[PDB]
Symmetry: C3
Subunit: 255 residues, 3 copies
């Protein structure tokens, strides 16, 4: 009992985990003094999940020692289905820990639920694959992006994002036919968060697997907007902005 | 780009397809100058689905050429799950078409989704099996008819509709037991659409498969009332009245 | 047509059956002059379900003859999915019956649905295993008890209820980790039905199967509170208080 990180609402940490729990299985939660960060590469080694949770995301955070505690998402999510969404979730562990302790407590002092989670042993191959300059950079409503991905997934397992100047084009092409959703950058004032931005330095023609994109758009529940950075050189970066933190999805193109 | 039929709301065409998509698989959409009509016989050749969609059902309809464009329901329904229920769905095709183009556009000009559907090749065995005079003719609330069919389906796979004068009797008889729902014709004034009519010229004792009836009652979402015409000679006619059009289910009795 | 028991709402009898239909399969409904009682032991012979339905639970009850009519829950529940929740459900049978008749009728006289259920032949091994004195006796909100059982079921198939003085402790221990929910007896005044009582005569350390507890907590829909009596000698008694009646779950501990 030494780091005891504490969330205001247990739902918040649950929503964060639920955002990327489907695309991966094992995760290396590397928590330190300035907060918690984590990475997780899937089995096929084509999708990286990078997470950062700052101090301000907690209502009371402490960590007198850099502790790397990896664990299974399926096991972690099971314990996360025990709270009452508004309970006080406290992540407790000690120096060189065997298990992480999750403490659920409501506003009243009737319910005091304490859970233990046997920690996994994960290799420390941390990746830094974010580029300085991307060929194209765009940001759109997360709910809108989920719509495009889900609709095109009906047609084929290959969604081709094609970006030219002032033209963002999503195209799917399968056996039963094809589909094409085309959006253009604009500005709104009644609700400026529905706006679409585009900063193209060079035209982009990349192809991504539909299987992976469907898991990526599940982070729409964490942010209203999604930042997409496309490059012909490095994997694409799908970023969801959290309150004092972020959830990144690095996806490698096909072909 | 020559016929371009256009719906006010994309939901309407989706609801129509959803009304009969389960009981069949391939459909021959025979659209012409006065609107669109279609037929579909299942594999077992005991259930016919006849559809008619008049000009008034569209908000803007054109067709300078009688075009028969058949297609797969499963593939068609997939594309129909892309709209936003209130988008402008436009069915576009050309003379001697390879594929039918479905264009989704909302009120604003942000979303312009265009889909292509590879057309099937369906045989032109169109059937006209509607009789002049049926032994019995009745009409009841569609939601009420769905209740009777669903409840009796629990007991056995054979639902026997038995009609005598002023007595409409639905009977199921299986291994675990039996059930009998009996309704009588009457008139209401607070909401005359809940009334039950019956025009019996001759008593009817027909037996239908529960499997088929369950698919037939799925058209209750298209009309408040359902018209049933029973004959000992020809297949029974279950008819749902659309706004400027209809959805018919011709079902052959057992034994 | 001789006993014709009658419920005010068909939903009530449906909810009662739905309370214990999952943990067993065959049930011996032994109805008599003062009401209806029934017992059902599962295949593994470790869980007994005892039911009592008094006269006051019906809106109109009669029974001129003690009749034991056993039946299959699955078949009984099927027929129970036919009503409209507010219909007049009437259980009809005769002296030495072959089948039990279930009559559904609404407030209006349009719907008159009559169902027959072929009665099963069940052995008359009725059990009286309730003790006089139990080591511990407690009562808590049924919704709260369901929460504890469901959450701990995620961890292992063995939930250990551990009771000491003024301390009720639920513990699960599995491969991925463990969990512990600890509640203490108190009194509320805004809503005294959320209170927790405990009358310990002797400390209790019993282990129950999670499979069975999950079925037991399904009776939370019948009562706000659940009475639990634990004994080291006899099976534990989980009791849900009905309006003029009860639903009991006798569960044998492990090890």
């Amino acid at each position: 009992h030494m780091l005891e990180a504490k969330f205001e609402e247990a739902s918040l940490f649950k929503r964060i985990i639920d955002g990327f729990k489907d695309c991966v299985q094992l995760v290396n939660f590397q928590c330190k003094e300035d907060g918690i960060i984590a990475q997780a590469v899937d089995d096929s080694r084509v999708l990286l999940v990078s997470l950062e949770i700052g101090v301000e995301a907690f209502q009371e955070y402490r960590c007198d020692h850099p502790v790397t505690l990896g664990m299974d998402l399926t096991s972690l999510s099971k314990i996360l289905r025990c709270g009452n969404n508004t309970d006080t979730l406290t992540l407790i562990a000690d120096n060189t820990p065997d298990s992480i302790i999750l403490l659920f407590e409501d506003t009243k002092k009737d319910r005091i639920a304490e859970y233990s989670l046997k920690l996994m042993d994960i290799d420390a191959d941390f990746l830094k694959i974010e580029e300085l300059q991307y060929d194209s950079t765009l940001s759109l409503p997360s709910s809108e992006f989920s719509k495009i991905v889900r609709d095109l997934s009906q047609l084929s397992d290959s969604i081709n994002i094609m970006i030219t100047k002032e033209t963002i084009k999503f195209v799917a092409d399968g056996d039963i036919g094809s589909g094409s959703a085309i959006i253009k950058p604009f500005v709104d004032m009644e609700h400026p968060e529905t706006s679409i931005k585009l900063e193209m330095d060079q035209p982009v023609d990349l192809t991504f697997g539909a299987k992976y994109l469907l898991d990526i758009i599940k982070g729409s529940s964490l942010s209203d907007r999604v930042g997409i950075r496309l490059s012909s050189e490095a994997p694409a970066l799908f970023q969801f902005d959290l309150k004092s933190g972020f959830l990144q999805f690095f996806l490698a193109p096909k072909f």
